[PDB]
Amino acid sequence: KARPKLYVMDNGRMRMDKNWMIAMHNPATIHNPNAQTEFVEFPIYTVLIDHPEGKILFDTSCNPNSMGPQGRWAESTQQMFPWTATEECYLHNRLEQLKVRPEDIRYVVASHLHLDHAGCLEMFTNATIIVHEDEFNGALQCYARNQKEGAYIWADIDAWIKNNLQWRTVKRHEDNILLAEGVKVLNFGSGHAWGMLGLHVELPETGGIILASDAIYTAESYGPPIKPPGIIYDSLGYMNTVERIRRIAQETKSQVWFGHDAEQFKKFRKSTEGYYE
Amino acid sequence: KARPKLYVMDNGRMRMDKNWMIAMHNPATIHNPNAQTEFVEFPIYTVLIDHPEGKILFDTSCNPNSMGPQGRWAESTQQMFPWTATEECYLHNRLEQLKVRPEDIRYVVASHLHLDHAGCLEMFTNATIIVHEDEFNGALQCYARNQKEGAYIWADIDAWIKNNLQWRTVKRHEDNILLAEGVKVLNFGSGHAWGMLGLHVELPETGGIILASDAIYTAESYGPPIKPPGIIYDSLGYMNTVERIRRIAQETKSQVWFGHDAEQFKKFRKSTEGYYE
Ligand SMILES: CCCCCC(=O)N[C@H]1CCOC1=O
Ligand SMILES: CCCCCC(=O)N[C@H]1CCOC1=O
Ligand SMILES: [Co+2]
Ligand SMILES: [Co+2]
Ligand SMILES: [Fe+3]
Ligand SMILES: [Fe+3]
């Protein structure tokens, strides 16, 4: 039986309007007609599965050259979704401390292609990049239409193409994919974005874990009841996905790891302290 | 050839958070982390078609007993979506000034069953009430689960049932319905709410008119580009509906009358000044 080790890697912090994360979280009233929102902070992280069959990476955080005047992100983007991270937080450094080079990664699973998950895809030229086909198509249209604003970074996409990444698209109606012993890719479909992927991992000692990414921002999103994000591509799809994750967790007695939950993240054992067997 | 007269009836004004009407209209930034929304005012109105084949009413505004301590609307609702109207603004009074009694109405078309469109359904006991089946089912579930908050008013629904209204549901996949010479019901389906209906009218002198209701809040919603509302049941469905309306307007050279557009409403000839032939 395979005895993998799973690492949680801290890739810094982001802030944005709380309305993005929880829609109409604090609506104006007759007694508060100019209601104020908040500017909340949350973690960006990635997960490495050191599996005997090969190393698997879930998400890739933000590109190190995202912020600043010479940054890849448009000015309006930087102001609405600012990212802060020290050098040791960069993905390539986190991996380095584990004695892992990018070239050692067999599979990268991209939950979706937003700026905070697909930032460092270009690094893994020796891997197969697993992504939802609808998410891929949508991003490429953004590129082709020369969209310089939004959550799809023109400069990042440019780099993927130039670096000749090897893509494996998950089809709209494609089943879950067994990646390795006790590791399965979940096809969540349209919701938060054009197409979302998750991961289910079964560890001998710790048991089952579901990586939900932005299918579920936080425990507050999860509920119940469900509290959806401010902007959504497919509201119906989003609601269905959350409830599907809940069912899976119950039936397999698995933990659910959210995309950007500050409190949950504090509890994790990170790559600087150890791993999950 | 039939020569109808179409009347626009002013049924008062409402206010709410602008984020309801235009999602993320003013997002927080690093420089404005506690961004403020606004509390915007907009008209509630209904349309009467005095047709030789019979009188047709589109929407019914709010119930006269909605607001106040003894009001049908929950406190939280009254504070988030306050309605103001004088006595002459009440639907029953507007009709009276045209020498029209509720019993004279042959057809009522309910665009949807929100508090500001289905308020006075209970009045028209001599009419056939045309509504989307999915919208009807959803409202009845709110009632059955004893939901006392939200945009579906428990007390309003209660009254419909007690007054023994005569329902004709539009099926999910049912075609447009010819109601009378030059009057057609449009099935928009799920979007803003569970199920939306519109109307297309062809007048000898004025030409074509599309009544969109909450399928399109305002000219700003309409664009292009489309700016969706803060909360939506079916985002995908909503976007599709707007574009469908644009196509119809172009192909038939029809004006589009929005649900709650203050500027457009000012330009209408109201029932106090005349009608459209
Ligand atoms: C459609 C999803 C909302 C678009 C804005 C965005 O990309 N926001 C990031 C921030 C953390 O996770 C997110 O989705
Ligand atoms: C579809 C969610 C409803 C948001 C609150 C609401 O019901 N607002 C009114 C005001 C005019 O049209 C509406 O739907
Ligand atoms: Co995202
Ligand atoms: Co409505
Ligand atoms: Fe994210
Ligand atoms: Fe409305």
Numbering used by the authors:
A (entry chain P), B (entry chain D): 7 to 283
Please share text taken word for word from the publication where this structure appeared:
The structure of GcL bound to C6-HSL (0.8 occupancy) is overall similar to the previously obtained structures of GcL bound to the substrates C4- and 3-oxo-dodecanoyl (3-oxo-C12)-HSL36. The lactone ring of the substrate sits on the bimetallic active site, with the carbonyl oxygen atom of the lactone ring interacting with the cobalt cation (2.6 Å) and the ester oxygen atom interacting with the iron cation (2.2 Å).
MLLs degrade N-acyl-L-homoserine lactones (AHLs), molecules that are used in a microbial communication system called quorum sensing (QS) to coordinate a variety of behaviors, including virulence and biofilm formation. The binuclear center, common to all MLLs, is coordinated by five histidine residues and two aspartic acid residues.
